[PDB]
Amino acid sequence: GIFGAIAGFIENGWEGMVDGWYGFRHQNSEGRGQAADLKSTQAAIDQINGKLNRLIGKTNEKFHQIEKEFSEVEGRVQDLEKYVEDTKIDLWSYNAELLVALENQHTIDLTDSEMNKLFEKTKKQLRENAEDMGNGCFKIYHKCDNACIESIRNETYDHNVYRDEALNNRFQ
Amino acid sequence: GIFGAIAGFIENGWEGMVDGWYGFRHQNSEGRGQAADLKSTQAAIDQINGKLNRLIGKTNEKFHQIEKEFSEVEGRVQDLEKYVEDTKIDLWSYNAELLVALENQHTIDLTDSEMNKLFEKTKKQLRENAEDMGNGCFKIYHKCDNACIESIRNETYDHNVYRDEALNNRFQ
Amino acid sequence: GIFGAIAGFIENGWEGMVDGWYGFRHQNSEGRGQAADLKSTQAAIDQINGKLNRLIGKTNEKFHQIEKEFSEVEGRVQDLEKYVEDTKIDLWSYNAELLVALENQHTIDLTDSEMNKLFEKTKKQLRENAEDMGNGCFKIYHKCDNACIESIRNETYDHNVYRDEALNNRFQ
Amino acid sequence: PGATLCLGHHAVPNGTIVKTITNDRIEVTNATELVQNSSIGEICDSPHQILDGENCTLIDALLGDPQCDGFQNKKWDLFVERSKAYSNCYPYDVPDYASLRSLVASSGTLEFKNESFNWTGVTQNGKSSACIRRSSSSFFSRLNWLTHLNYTYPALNVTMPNKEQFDKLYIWGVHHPGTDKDQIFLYAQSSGRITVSTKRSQQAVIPNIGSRPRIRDIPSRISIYWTIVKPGDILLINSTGNLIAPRGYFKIRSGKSSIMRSDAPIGKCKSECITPNGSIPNDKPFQNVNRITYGACPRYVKHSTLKLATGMRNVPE
Amino acid sequence: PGATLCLGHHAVPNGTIVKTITNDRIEVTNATELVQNSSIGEICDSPHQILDGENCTLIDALLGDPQCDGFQNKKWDLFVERSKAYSNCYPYDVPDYASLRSLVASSGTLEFKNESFNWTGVTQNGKSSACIRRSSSSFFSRLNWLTHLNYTYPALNVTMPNKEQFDKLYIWGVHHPGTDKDQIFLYAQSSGRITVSTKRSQQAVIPNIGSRPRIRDIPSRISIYWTIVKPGDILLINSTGNLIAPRGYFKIRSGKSSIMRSDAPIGKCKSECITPNGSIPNDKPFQNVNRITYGACPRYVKHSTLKLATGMRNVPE
Amino acid sequence: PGATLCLGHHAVPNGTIVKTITNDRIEVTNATELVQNSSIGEICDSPHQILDGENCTLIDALLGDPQCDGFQNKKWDLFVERSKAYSNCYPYDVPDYASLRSLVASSGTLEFKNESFNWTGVTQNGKSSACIRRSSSSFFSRLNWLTHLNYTYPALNVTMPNKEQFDKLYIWGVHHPGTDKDQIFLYAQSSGRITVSTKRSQQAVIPNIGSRPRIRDIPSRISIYWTIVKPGDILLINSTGNLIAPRGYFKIRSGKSSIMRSDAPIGKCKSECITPNGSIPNDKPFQNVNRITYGACPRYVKHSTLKLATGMRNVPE
Ligand SMILES: CC(=O)N[C@@H]1[C@@H](O)[C@H](O[C@@H]2O[C@H](CO)[C@H](O)[C@H](O[C@@H]3O[C@H](CO)[C@@H](O[C@@H]4O[C@H](CO[C@]5(C(=O)O)C[C@H](O)[C@@H](NC(C)=O)[C@H]([C@H](O)[C@H](O)CO)O5)[C@H](O)[C@H](O)[C@H]4O)[C@H](O)[C@H]3NC(C)=O)[C@H]2O)[C@@H](CO)O[C@H]1O
Ligand SMILES: CC(=O)N[C@@H]1[C@@H](O)[C@H](O[C@@H]2O[C@H](CO)[C@H](O)[C@H](O[C@@H]3O[C@H](CO)[C@@H](O[C@@H]4O[C@H](CO[C@]5(C(=O)O)C[C@H](O)[C@@H](NC(C)=O)[C@H]([C@H](O)[C@H](O)CO)O5)[C@H](O)[C@H](O)[C@H]4O)[C@H](O)[C@H]3NC(C)=O)[C@H]2O)[C@@H](CO)O[C@H]1O
Ligand SMILES: CC(=O)N[C@@H]1[C@@H](O)[C@H](O[C@@H]2O[C@H](CO)[C@H](O)[C@H](O[C@@H]3O[C@H](CO)[C@@H](O[C@@H]4O[C@H](CO[C@]5(C(=O)O)C[C@H](O)[C@@H](NC(C)=O)[C@H]([C@H](O)[C@H](O)CO)O5)[C@H](O)[C@H](O)[C@H]4O)[C@H](O)[C@H]3NC(C)=O)[C@H]2O)[C@@H](CO)O[C@H]1O
Ligand SMILES: *[C@@H]1O[C@H](CO)[C@@H](O[C@@H]2O[C@H](CO)[C@@H](O[C@@H]3O[C@H](CO[C@H]4O[C@H](CO)[C@@H](O)[C@H](O)[C@@H]4O)[C@@H](O)[C@H](O[C@H]4O[C@H](CO)[C@@H](O)[C@H](O)[C@@H]4O)[C@@H]3O)[C@H](O)[C@H]2NC(C)=O)[C@H](O)[C@H]1NC(C)=O
Ligand SMILES: *[C@@H]1O[C@H](CO)[C@@H](O[C@@H]2O[C@H](CO)[C@@H](O[C@@H]3O[C@H](CO[C@H]4O[C@H](CO)[C@@H](O)[C@H](O)[C@@H]4O)[C@@H](O)[C@H](O[C@H]4O[C@H](CO)[C@@H](O)[C@H](O)[C@@H]4O)[C@@H]3O)[C@H](O)[C@H]2NC(C)=O)[C@H](O)[C@H]1NC(C)=O
Ligand SMILES: *[C@@H]1O[C@H](CO)[C@@H](O[C@@H]2O[C@H](CO)[C@@H](O[C@@H]3O[C@H](CO[C@H]4O[C@H](CO)[C@@H](O)[C@H](O)[C@@H]4O)[C@@H](O)[C@H](O[C@H]4O[C@H](CO)[C@@H](O)[C@H](O)[C@@H]4O)[C@@H]3O)[C@H](O)[C@H]2NC(C)=O)[C@H](O)[C@H]1NC(C)=O
Ligand SMILES: *[C@@H]1O[C@H](CO)[C@@H](O[C@@H]2O[C@H](CO)[C@@H](O[C@@H]3O[C@H](CO[C@H]4O[C@H](CO)[C@@H](O)[C@H](O)[C@@H]4O)[C@@H](O)[C@H](O[C@H]4O[C@H](CO)[C@@H](O)[C@H](O)[C@@H]4O)[C@@H]3O)[C@H](O)[C@H]2NC(C)=O)[C@H](O)[C@H]1NC(C)=O
Ligand SMILES: *[C@@H]1O[C@H](CO)[C@@H](O[C@@H]2O[C@H](CO)[C@@H](O[C@@H]3O[C@H](CO[C@H]4O[C@H](CO)[C@@H](O)[C@H](O)[C@@H]4O)[C@@H](O)[C@H](O[C@H]4O[C@H](CO)[C@@H](O)[C@H](O)[C@@H]4O)[C@@H]3O)[C@H](O)[C@H]2NC(C)=O)[C@H](O)[C@H]1NC(C)=O
Ligand SMILES: *[C@@H]1O[C@H](CO)[C@@H](O[C@@H]2O[C@H](CO)[C@@H](O[C@@H]3O[C@H](CO[C@H]4O[C@H](CO)[C@@H](O)[C@H](O)[C@@H]4O)[C@@H](O)[C@H](O[C@H]4O[C@H](CO)[C@@H](O)[C@H](O)[C@@H]4O)[C@@H]3O)[C@H](O)[C@H]2NC(C)=O)[C@H](O)[C@H]1NC(C)=O
Q1: Which atom of ligand 3 is nearest to the CA of F129?
Q2: Cα–Cα dist B170/C5, whole Å
Q3: Do D80 and D199 belong together in one domain?
Q4: Is E179 near ligand 6, meaning CB less than 6 Å away?
Q5: E220 Cβ below 6 A of ligand 2
Q6: Alpha-carbon distances, residue C41 vs C23, C117, D276 (angstroms)
Q7: Which sites carry carbohydrate (chains D, E, F) (predicted)?
Q8: Do D3 and D66 fall within a single domain?
Q9: How many whole angstroms separate alpha carbon F302 and alpha carbon C90?
């Protein structure tokens, strides 16, 4: 990806996360768990659904057209009829495969971005209470029980509550 | 946006900024003000103007062409004349609406990027003298009068001048 | 670029780096050197080679087609033969120049991204042992001999070894 | 002890390969095929009104070939011509055959109204053993073979006005006798002349006497022509022999009707899109089944598969 | 106390909705319409040279219909044909009418040079009451109706060399008498023959005697044909009757000229682009006004609006 | 003292300008041209089989113009017609000349098989001084000029069955005598009739007597026609004069063959793509050399250069 998160500083994905596209895995004094993030998952799904709504069920009605198969040799007009249809098919074949290649490149990049967006949001929440371990994980320098972990996932975490404890642990 | 600033970690835009596209709002001992950033605004406008110069006033000259309306039934050749024009219109209609959808997606993303670029430039300027509040705002941990604020907007701010004062306030 | 590294917070490129596209320049007690980064250089080259493999040596075979030059005036059918070919050429001319403009915009942006990816990887490696000077360079706050510099370029650098020395120098 | 919080994404054990701008083989969590590659092998008779020609070409059903009598006055959205179809009447050809087939197909009807022309001094209802209807020599139902009466052929001059509110399609023709003797045996002179005209058109045909290879023991030939009469216009036939006269007119409509060559059977189902291979679903925007389509159809491309990624890059554990 | 520095962007209370790849309704600060949807309702007479045909078709102005005498030797960049136009001379048709209309339109001129052919033994200047010029029976200005003189029609054999440095366009025709008696009354024999030829072309027409419906009390018809003579080539007319002779040649040019059917009035303004609805601005790259265009024109598409975003996403307070 | 670690990228002193979506002049480290702008100025004779027509048109080599005798039974992938080519036999024209040239070109062969028709009562091998072969009056090699024998012309009725497994191409024609006297001098009557027919086709031609300008002192003309006979079908010629008879048939194949007008010389090299300017490399996907191409060719566009960036933005020191 062009943002460097998916297949980047995150080494791999979680096959065990079946209820979300992005989420958190934690490790505290009460154990280790996994939870999906709603906003980032919906943002990626909404964008992909916007692409599908443009392409699925959007066909064009054509009725009487020109002949496109010929049993006998005729000449000038038949050559043009064949040339017109071959020209049209090549242009639409170009349109179709270029469209898929462009959209797939964008789809991979927008899903990479949502992952990077969620990591940055979490990092800003923790302020000086955590440090980036480089692999998508944060080292949290204070006791963060389950309620403290949920407060980060719910965007209600107050860094000021644990700042003195965290700054003390960080600077030994 | 794919960078997550506009409609992202910045909650909304400033309707009161009419002289620039991106800028600063501050709060110090001397009051609170607003100022636009020249470089980032011009970067976004230049890119959009580059798109307009490709599309505005760039029409093609066509003179004698084929007939495209018909009062009577004729047959084979008229069918091809209609099929050729209908084929051409569908391809250009596809080209036109795909072009706008692609450019609008890129325009939203490049304007999101300039906003993110300016935030990162400001963050690097402050070094250890400020902390990211998460909503696009910096908490500056020293007395920063109007001249100090202008020095950040003019890229003449020296972090070393206020480092001892800032580090002291940050680590109580 | 849309990521703001190349022609962004990095003031210019190194004409003296002929063995790589991205790399490091250092300054320590043992001197100053330059070294290329393999992974980021290969990532950009692989992506560009993927574009070339789609466009180079991928021509279409056409044999018997319609006439496209005419010495005498004929009429209705000749008008259509000319109109069909002119219509086809305009569409492929549009396809060709739009393709190049889109790919060049993407190529500049993906090379800008790899530069940003490498900077972020290096920053995360150093943790609290270095600070961002804002121009793509890190101020390292401990003695980092040649072996220490190679450990950063080889992703074997342990921040814990120099943390106490670095934190002490950073907070005077 | 502290805590560790890891940010991450999902992955699947069974990923899908897709093409991108920079890489032609990249695995994503999920994709969807954008190219319809199959048909059900039959032509659904809904929502389009299908008319199976079976043994009859549309042109044969127009003229009145005896095996096509069941097609009289039929309408259709799509007329399906079978490759097994064959002519079985007087041997004929149509100059610009494809244009007449196209105009009748797009009109979408064989609605025919009989008309009384003043063929006063001629023998009507000429028949032949090459056109057998009910174990008896017959002729095209919609055409009127005129021959001499009392060994004389009077120069015809007949009028037919169009007082309707729609255009009329008249199908007529000229007989090409195999020998100069047959031209005497049928029309009592060696020089046939035909001039069908309106206020907006004129057509003139001269017979071409000569031997053609025999079809059903007939070395003669008929050449079919057509004429369109606008409202307020008038048909005017002026002939001294060899005229295959019209018995009336067809209504020429304008709509969504067309024709398709196909051997696929007709089925009891619903599908907006029809190809000669059969009906195809039209949820996808592209298809490589057939360049010949009818209805709301995916556009024909020459790629067998184009997978649109519907998920992120797949990085399994 | 410290300080707070906030980074942000602008917004507007009145945003515009645009389409994107992932979202078909998204608000931006500003957009611009890329599809021209309107015309001024008139055809500007600058910069293109407009020739209003008014009551005359281009073909009628070519032959010399009396109401089109003011069009003699006129030039144009765009000839505008009105739907009110009507023919008012001898009843005629042109085999491949559209090709002659196209070749004259693209040439862009009616410049005509009179020439003296050797019509020695025939009666020139045949007229008719169907073609009235100045309250008197007349004929097409550029055509020469030849009839018998002293009840004899001598087999004509006339030559005309092309010693110019440009191609010549000769307009001629054949008369189709309504009856076999009229063919005697006009050309003193029943068999007319026509053979117009050069070193690069040959054309042969036989009259078709027969009754057509009457237009201005004329059951006869004329069929117009044309011939192109290259520099160094020679025109050769060889006929024994029914020949509508040319009075000269037209210069055939090559340039930007064409023809357009339109009822829009001509106005005093400037516009590079012309449609049958009238002139349209050409600043935008697309338009849905008309698929028929002339000049530097936006390309026709079938979308009524395509807004290109010219600002960021709008997030108001 | 510490240390300083700088992240950066490479640059070059000699950058290349390219176009982008937001900027039409931007410098990158390296680019590659996607539009082929030049040819080698000659047509490589590999891998496609090139047949140089030199002084002969493909149609002249088909009929048997004496200077084209070396082209008998030749095959080709690309027939190259030179602008210097000229006809040098009996003066002729071909109605729908381009269609016959196209069908012979796409067939890719002049393989001819002689056949014995029953021209019992006529004089075969009619010759002329306009068609000189070996300093002697001659005729088209593949055509058989039939005239009277003992001042009588018997009504011909000849058959030729197609018992092969391929279609047959028969080239025949009609003679147009310059005067009514020549029509007597050659065929002993004033009315020639021709009726070439199969079970699937009928063709009828009447001569058109009249004077055409003289080419090699011949005011007469020949009009060439063709007929295709399917397997199991039968050719049937029935004529009373003016028939230019076929001497046999050509094999009509189907493949990759075509024809190209070009004055470029043929060279000893290899190139998949051929243009009238000469062969061009086909590594690039686009070209602005010529819209007329043959083989695996880059697509023609109207841009002279389109540089694809193959490196990052160039920011030199
Ligand atoms: C009182 C008296 O004596 N009066 C005289 C009359 O005798 C004379 O009449 C003519 O006499 C000659 C004498 O040989 C001849 O019999 C004429 O009849 C024609 O005969 C030929 C040869 O048998 C025949 O050709 C054969 O046709 C069949 C197929 O026949 C039909 C068919 O297609 O089924 C029969 C149809 O009725 C007929 N259609 C019409 C409208 O008449 C068609 C049509 O004739 C052909 O299709 C035209 O191509 O044919 C088969 O094809 C055989 O191979 C073929 O040899 C003709 O069909 C007979 N013609 C007719 C009209 O029946 C007979 O008229 C009179 C005139 O000379 O003179 C009096 O004085
Ligand atoms: C000394 C002597 O006695 N000499 C003999 C001559 O009498 C004789 O001349 C012919 O005599 C017959 C006798 O009935 C007849 O009058 C011939 O004249 C034709 O008459 C018919 C019937 O009236 C007429 O047809 C009518 O035409 C009008 C419209 O007329 C014009 C027109 O279109 O305005 C008049 C034009 O001058 C004329 N154009 C030319 C070039 O001549 C055209 C043209 O004839 C038609 O347009 C052709 O379609 O017609 C109206 O349409 C009526 O409905 C229609 O009935 C013909 O037009 C008359 N023909 C001519 C040439 O005027 C008369 O020639 C001579 C020959 O038989 O024998 C001598 O011995
Ligand atoms: C025993 C007896 O007395 N018998 C009688 C015969 O005399 C008589 O024969 C005819 O007599 C007349 C008398 O004037 C005449 O000579 C006939 O011959 C024609 O002559 C004209 C004029 O010289 C000639 O036209 C000239 O043609 C040349 C070019 O000639 C060729 C050519 O193209 O090279 C020669 C070819 O052999 C010939 N091709 C064929 C198949 O015959 C062609 C062809 O005739 C033309 O190309 C047709 O357009 O011509 C040059 O072009 C001159 O400009 C031109 O004037 C004709 O070519 C001669 N015709 C023939 C067939 O040779 C002669 O037949 C007999 C019949 O009337 O009556 C007996 O009783
Ligand atoms: C120009 O030249 C062509 C040459 O073909 C002539 O056309 C032919 O004309 C003859 C009659 O003159 C036609 O012959 C007829 O064909 C039928 C043949 O049937 C038998 O043979 C076939 C196989 O060839 C078998 O399938 C079939 O079962 C039979 O065994 C016959 O039906 C005809 O009459 C037969 O029956 C009657 C009644 O018993 C007998 O009197 C006959 O002797 C014969 O047995 C007849 O034989 C031939 O078909 C025509 N061919 C074509 C291609 O048209 C043209 O006529 C000539 N031009 C002119 C003006 O004459
Ligand atoms: C469209 O339809 C119209 C008719 O509706 C056709 O026009 C008719 O066709 C012919 C044209 O040649 C005309 O008939 C001819 O009559 C002539 C004989 O004149 C008779 O009448 C006069 C009157 O005074 C008498 O003096 C004379 O004695 C005759 O009685 C001859 O040229 C022909 O007749 C032949 O047969 C008769 C009968 O056996 C013999 O007695 C004659 O000697 C001669 O051999 C010829 O039949 C007829 O008059 C035309 N009508 C009109 C109103 O003009 C068109 O031809 C037709 N067009 C097409 C394209 O089909
Ligand atoms: C083949 O068949 C067609 C059949 O239509 C013949 O063509 C017709 O020929 C007749 C003459 O024979 C034409 O009749 C002429 O029409 C005019 C009619 O004008 C009156 O009627 C109309 C409405 O129908 C009104 O609008 C108009 O105001 C009039 O009330 C007349 O102008 C003609 O002459 C009239 O005036 C003169 C002088 O006073 C009188 O002598 C007449 O009696 C008459 O009053 C004449 O009546 C008719 O128009 C033709 N129709 C068509 C469609 O062409 C062909 O002639 C025939 N073929 C052959 C060879 O004859
Ligand atoms: C292109 O133009 C040329 C002329 O420029 C045409 O050719 C002329 O057309 C005809 C062809 O049939 C020729 O005229 C004919 O003359 C014959 C009579 O011969 C006369 O001269 C001889 C000379 O010895 C005398 O012996 C004889 O007695 C005659 O005096 C006849 O076939 C015809 O004449 C008829 O009318 C005359 C006069 O009334 C009668 O006396 C006759 O008995 C007969 O009934 C016929 O008119 C003429 O000679 C040709 N010229 C040339 C140079 O060949 C082309 O036909 C033309 N082509 C086209 C397509 O229009
Ligand atoms: C309809 O009208 C056309 C008018 O062109 C007639 O066609 C012309 O017919 C004449 C013969 O009647 C042709 O004349 C022949 O042309 C040749 C000319 O050669 C000389 O002139 C040219 C330049 O014009 C020079 O390049 C050349 O070197 C010569 O100086 C001659 O070869 C012919 O005969 C000559 O030689 C013989 C033998 O010595 C002499 O008997 C002759 O007098 C003459 O010297 C002859 O002169 C002319 O070319 C034709 N032109 C065209 C365009 O075809 C049609 O014939 C006429 N229709 C009918 C039916 O007659
Ligand atoms: C395709 O090919 C076939 C032949 O293969 C052609 O058909 C032949 O063409 C003509 C048609 O008109 C026929 O020939 C004619 O013969 C008649 C004379 O009949 C003779 O035989 C009878 C038999 O009883 C005798 O009583 C009589 O006295 C004759 O001996 C006349 O109409 C013509 O003959 C002329 O010349 C002769 C000889 O000089 C004179 O004696 C006559 O008086 C007359 O002036 C004419 O020649 C022939 O019979 C046809 N054959 C058949 C089988 O039908 C087709 O025409 C042809 N088609 C095309 C398009 O080319």
Answers
A1: 34
A2: 30
A3: yes
A4: yes
A5: yes
A6: 8, 11, 52
A7: 37, 277
A8: no
A9: 8
Q: Which residues of A touch B80 (CB under 8 A)?
A: 66, 77, 80-81, 84
B61 and chain E in contact, CB less than 8 A: yes
* CB distance F124 to ligand 9 below 6 Å: no
Task: Determine the residue among D103, D167, D199, D228 to mutate to test chain B binding: the one whose Cβ has the most chain B Cβ atoms within 10 Å.
Answer: D103
Partner residue opposite E193 with nearest CB, options F93, F210, F213: F210
Closest CA to D49 of D263, D298, D274: D274
Question: Which spans in chain D are helix H?
Answer: 58-63, 97-107, 180-187
Instruction: Provide the CA A29 distance to its chain's centre, in angstroms.
Output: 32
Which three-class secondary structure string do you get for chain E? Answer: CCEEEEEEEECCCCCEEECCCCCCCEEECCEEECEECCCCCCEEEECCCEEECCCCCHHHHHHCCHHHHHHCCCECCEEEECCCCCCCCCCEECCCHHHHHHHHHHHCECCEEECCCCCCCCECCCCEEEEECCCCEECCCCEEECECECCECCCEEEEEECCCCCCEEEEEEEEECCCHHHHHHHHCCCCCCEEEECCCCEEEECCCCCCCCCCCCCCCEEEEEEEEECCCCEEEEEECCCEEEECEEEECCCCCCEEEECCCCEEEEECCEEECCEEECCCCCEECCCCCCEEEECEECCCCCCEEECCCECCCC
β-strands E78-81, E258-261 pairing = parallel
Q: Where are the domains of chain C?
A: 23-53+73-170
The answer to whether residues C64 and F105 touch, using CB atoms and an 8 Å cutoff, is yes
CB contact under 8 A, F228 and A79: no
Q: Are residues D80 and D97 in the same domain?
A: yes
Residue with tokens 């790919």: C103
Give, in order, the Cα–Cα distances in Å from A53 to each of B59, C156, F72. Answer: 31, 47, 62
The vertex-B20 CA angle with B18 and B23, nearest 5°, equals 115
Mutation to test the B interface, candidates A84, A114, A132, A141, most B Cβ within 10 Å:
A84
Is the Cβ pair B138, E4 closer than 8 Å? Answer: yes
φ, ψ dihedrals at D215, nearest 5°? -120, 120
Structure tokens at F85: 């080519």
Residue range of the domain that includes E21: 1-40+271-317
The answer to whether B50 contacts chain F (CB < 8 Å) is: yes
Per DSSP, which regions of chain B are E strands?
22-27, 34-36, 60-62, 130-132, 137-140
User: What was the experiment behind these coordinates?
Assistant: X-ray
D135 CA → ligand 1 middle, Å: 20
**The CATH number of the domain where F313 resides is what?**
2.10.77.10
One-letter amino acid of C60: N
Class level of CATH domain A23-51+77-170: alpha beta
User: How many Å apart are CA E29 and CA E13, to the nearest integer?
Assistant: 9
List the CATH number of the domain containing F215: 3.90.209.20
